[PDB]
Amino acid sequence: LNQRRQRSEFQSKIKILLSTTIKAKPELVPSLLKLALNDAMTYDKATKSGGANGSIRFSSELSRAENEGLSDGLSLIEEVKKEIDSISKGGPISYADIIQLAGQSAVKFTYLASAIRKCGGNEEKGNLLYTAYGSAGQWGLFDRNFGRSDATEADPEGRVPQWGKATVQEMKDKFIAVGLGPRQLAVMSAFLGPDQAATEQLLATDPQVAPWVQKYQRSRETVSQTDYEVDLITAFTKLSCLGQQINFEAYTYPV
Ligand SMILES: [Ca+2]
């Protein structure tokens, strides 16, 4: 209870810091997305190893081809972690959490950009449109999965595609291997590359994924894009806590 509150007050502070930082550096949004994906996609059921554990901060993992071009995003993460650590009442925040939290703020940024765009670039109105729904209420479960532990080393090599050079079947296999499938692959378009339209053109060439891409394209044309937003959150939520046992009392302190 009191811990539920402490945690959420601590999340508010994190979120305002993330959105203002992302606001100063929007060209890193694709990096933050991919950083959250590539930290998570090492999860391997059989050996219960890998997953969303912050391993990706290790130079040994960061120099892997699949992780090319992610230095700048990881600097933003370090900078933001140092700032969050200085105001936390319940200890430093883990890398695994900040990486997934940077992901959430980047997602929100791409939703806000939609609203603004749908309003003839007018930024003041697009903010009101975005605020209207969210789907801020759909972040509920995601917001509860706060308290991930840090890995102390790189995740094993060889479990993450170089998305940019990958065929769609290498791509489906990655989602399948982690318990997902063609629908999650489609809705997580933005995570795969800096150019979602291009990513989605590639994805529509495989008939298993096609109907999902067309569905989400349709949803993104409606003003509210509710099904795109809700489904992304759902699958991202599953992805961000894989291999992780959440400490529901993390970031707690005397009342
Ligand atoms: Ca990892």
From Swiss-Prot:
Superkingdom: Eukaryota
Claim: Chloroplast is one of the keywords in the record: yes
Kinase as UniProt keyword: no
Primary location group: plastid
Entry keywords, A to Z: Chloroplast, Oxidoreductase, Phosphoprotein, Plastid, Thylakoid, Transit peptide
EC id: 1.-.-.-
Family: Belongs to the peroxidase family.
Protein name per UniProt: Thylakoid lumenal 29 kDa protein, chloroplastic
Organism encoding this protein: Arabidopsis thaliana
Residues of the full protein shown: 85 to 339 of 349
